[PDB]
Amino acid sequence: AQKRSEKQYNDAQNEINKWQRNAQLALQKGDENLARQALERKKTYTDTSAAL
């Protein structure tokens, strides 16, 4: 369980990181709308991380 949750929490961090790059990539291309929606995912995953 400890290792299972750890991976999930580690994946959450990775997910957040992945979103960051995608959100940052959207900003570079001029798509702030998608970037703003990607920030919600970060927050959503950050909240999930906290729970985990």
Binding site: L25, K29, Q37
Partner: protein
Amino acid sequence: VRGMNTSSAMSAFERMEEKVLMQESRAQALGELAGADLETQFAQLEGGSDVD
């Protein structure tokens, strides 16, 4: 011509014209539900990024 209970043409349209459009609308409705994912919007960015 006026439209009797079992008029071959009029009655056929009641079940054909109506249902056909219903299924068509469902496709778009259900299709839009499957395309609401934010990761699909990131794929569009990837396409433009990959070509450059």
